[PDB]
Design an enzyme around this catalytic site. Structure first.
Site, PDB file in Angstrom:
ATOM      1  CE  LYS A  27       1.780   9.496   2.010  1.00 40.22           C
ATOM      2  NZ  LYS A  27       1.071   8.098   1.302  1.00 40.22           N
ATOM      3  CB  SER A  50      -2.341   3.101  -3.911  1.00 36.56           C
ATOM      4  OG  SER A  50      -1.390   2.437  -3.109  1.00 36.56           O
TER       5      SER A  50
END
Ligand SMILES: [Cl-]
Ligand SMILES: [Cl-]
Ligand code: NA
Ligand code: NA
Lengths: 320, 320
Positions: free
Chosen positions: B50, B273
C-alpha cells in the site's frame, strides 16, 4: 557479499536481501547547516542491522568448518534483535537455534522467535539478563554440538560491517564522510564502518554513542537504561576503542523524544537507538565547525518491533 | 518513479524508497517442476504494497491540483494497510489525515496510525466496517477540503502498478513470466501488473485469488473471512476483470497454514494474503502444464503487523 542489484535480479535465498540498505537525508528534523545521512538498517529483511551479524555468523562459521547444518546447535542469550536474526536464518539453513531470555519478557519477544521454530528457554525473572547469559553458557559448556553465537566477541561482527556497511556508506555519500556516529551495542557497526572509512582515506571523526544512564565507555558505572540494543554494561571485545574520536552520551528520554519526532517529521519509524543516534547526530550537526559537512549515522531497527515497549507509550496512552 | 539505485545513492525523502522491491525464488517450500518468484512488497518502507498506492495518491493528486498540502484533508476508512501508508506519507507531506475504523479494532491498528499523527475516528462496533465507511463518506460530504482517498476506485491505483510493480517484475524475471497470480483487494496490483505485462508482449496467464469464504468474483455471496487485505465483498472499480484468465479461491485456513510454513522453509515472514498467494502459486505450480514455467506472485505485507492476529495464534498458543 559482492554487490547484487536487488531491484533488477531474483534472489535465490532471502539472505541475499540482507545489507545493501538505503541511505536517506534527514530533512524536516534537520534545522542545522550540516547534512545528516541516515543508513537505513531498519530496511533489512528481518528489520534490523542484526541481519548482517546473523548472516556473517552462519556464512563465515560454515565456510571455516565451525558450523555444520543439522549437527551444530546455535545458542545465544538475547532479548532483542540478535536472537531474531539468528532464529530467522537458522531456520532456513537447517540449524537448531536456542535462545535464552528471562521469563518476564513480553509475549511478542518470545512469540517472534518461536515463529521461526527457535527453541526459547526462559530463565528466572529475578536473575534478569545475567541468568539468561548463564543458562546459554551452561548449555554450550555441556553439549559438544552447541556453540555460542558470541555476539559481543565474535571476529565476524566488525568484519561484516567493514566488508559491507562501510563500503555501501562510502559509495552512497560519494566518498564524503566528515563524521560517522553509532550507538555501541556489540560495537560491530561502529568498529567495522570506522575501519572501512579509514582504509578509504577518510578523515571522518568516529563517534560512539552510549546511554547517559549506563556510561561505561565514558568511565562511569553500568546501570539499567531504556535504549534497547546499545549500552550492554561492559566494554564488548568486538569494540576497538582505538578508532573512536569521541564518546557522546545520550539520555534515554532524548532518544525516546527524538524517535517520536522522527516519525512525524521525516517518516522514519524506528526504535530507541535510532532515536539516540539521530539526537546525537543533530547535536554534532549544531556545532559551528560542522557547517556544510556530512554526518552519517544509522537507523538500526524498524519501529514496528517496539509498538509494545515504553518507546511509544506516550502515543499508547494518548490512544487509550 | 524513474529507476534510482537505492543501494548506491542517498534519497532526499523516504518516499523515494517505495517500490523497486526485491524478488525471491521460493525454494524449500517449492517441491514442483515450476519456478515460483515472490515479488517482495513486504520490503517497502512501511512494510506493505500500500506504500505504492499511498504515494501514487499524494503524488499524482498534487500534480493534478487536487490536493494542496496544509489545506486538503485526506480521509479513508481502513482497518489495514492503506490507512497506515496514508497516515505515514500524509505526515511528511503536510496533510491532515483522518482514518475511520470500528471501535473494536486492536490497540496496535489504532496506535500505529496515531504514531504518524493521523486523526483516528472510531465508529460503533456493532456497525462494523460499514459504519466506518459511512463515517468517512459523511466527513468528505460535509467538508469542502476533505477528500476521500477512494482506494477501491481511484485511477491512480492500477496506474502506479502499471508504471512500477509490473516493469520491475519484467526486468527481474528477464522478460519471462508464464503466470502472474495476486489476491484482489482493490484489484490495483493484479490490474496494473497485467497491463504492463500485456504491453510488453507477455502471454502470462493472469490469476486473481479470492477467499473461498467470500467468493465474489466467482459469482458467490460476500461473507466474513480471515484473509486480511483481500476479499472486500464487492467487485472494486479499480479491478479490470477483462484481464483475468482465472479466479482461484483459496480458503482462509490454507492461507494461514501456508504463511506459518513459509517462515520456517524460506524465511519469508508475511500476513494472511502472502500465505494465500503462495498457496495459489504452489497449486498452479503442481499442474503438469506448468513444468519448467515461471510463476510470479506477490508477498503483500510483512508479518510483524500480524503478530497479534489470528494468523500466528497457533504459535501464540504454543508459546503461552
Ligand atoms: Cl532503532
Ligand atoms: Cl501479506
Ligand atoms: Na523487511
Ligand atoms: Na521497512
Amino acid at each position: 557479499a559482492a554487490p547484487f542489484d536487488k531491484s533488477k535480479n531474483v534472489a535465490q535465498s532471502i539472505d541475499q536481501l540482507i545489507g545493501q540498505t538505503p541511505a536517506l537525508y534527514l530533512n524536516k528534523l534537520n534545522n542545522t547547516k550540516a547534512k545528516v545521512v541516515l543508513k537505513m538498517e531498519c530496511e533489512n529483511p528481518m528489520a534490523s542491522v542484526k541481519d548482517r551479524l546473523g548472516f556473517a555468523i552462519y556464512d563465515k562459521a560454515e565456510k571455516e568448518g565451525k558450523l555444520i547444518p543439522g549437527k551444530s546447535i546455535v545458542v545465544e542469550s538475547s532479548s532483542g534483535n540478535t536472537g531474531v536474526s539468528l532464529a530467522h536464518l537458522g531456520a532456513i539453513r537447517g540449524y537448531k537455534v536456542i535462545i535464552t531470555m528471562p521469563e518476564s519478557m513480553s509475549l511478542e519477544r518470545r512469540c517472534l522467535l518461536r515463529i521461526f521454530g527457535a527453541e526459547v528457554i526462559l530463565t528466572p525473572a529475578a536473575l534478569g539478563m545475567k541468568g539468561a547469559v548463564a543458562m546459554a553458557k551452561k548449555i554450550v559448556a555441556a553439549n559438544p554440538n552447541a556453540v555460542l553465537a558470541d555476539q559481543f566477541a565474535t571476529k565476524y561482527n566488525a568484519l561484516i560491517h567493514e566488508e559491507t556497511t562501510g563500503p555501501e556508506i562510502w559509495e552512497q555519500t560519494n566518498h564524503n564522510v566528515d563524521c560517522f556516529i553509532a550507538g555501541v551495542g556489540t560495537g560491530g557497526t561502529l568498529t567495522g564502518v570506522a575501519r572501512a572509512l579509514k582504509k578509504m582515506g577518510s578523515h571522518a571523526r568516529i563517534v560512539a554513542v552510549e546511554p547517559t544512564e549506563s556510561p561505561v565507555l565514558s568511565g562511569g558505572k553500568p546501570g539499567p537504561h531504556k535504549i534497547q540494543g546499545i549500552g550492554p554494561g561492559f566494554v564488548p571485545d568486538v569494540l576497538d576503542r582505538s578508532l573512536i574520536d569521541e564518546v557522546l552520551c545520550v539520555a534515554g528520554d532524548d532518544a525516546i523524544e527524538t524517535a517520536l519526532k522522527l516519525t512525524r517529521s521525516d517518516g522514519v519509524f524506528c526504535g530507541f537507538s535510532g532515536g539516540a543516534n539521530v539526537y546525537a547526530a543533530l547535536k554534532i550537526a549544531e556545532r559551528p565547525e560542522m557547517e556544510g559537512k556530512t554526518i552519517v549515522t544509522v537507523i538500526p531497527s524498524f519501529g514496528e518491533r517496539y509498538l509494545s515497549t515504553t518507546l511509544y507509550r506516550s502515543v499508547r496512552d494518548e490512544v487509550s
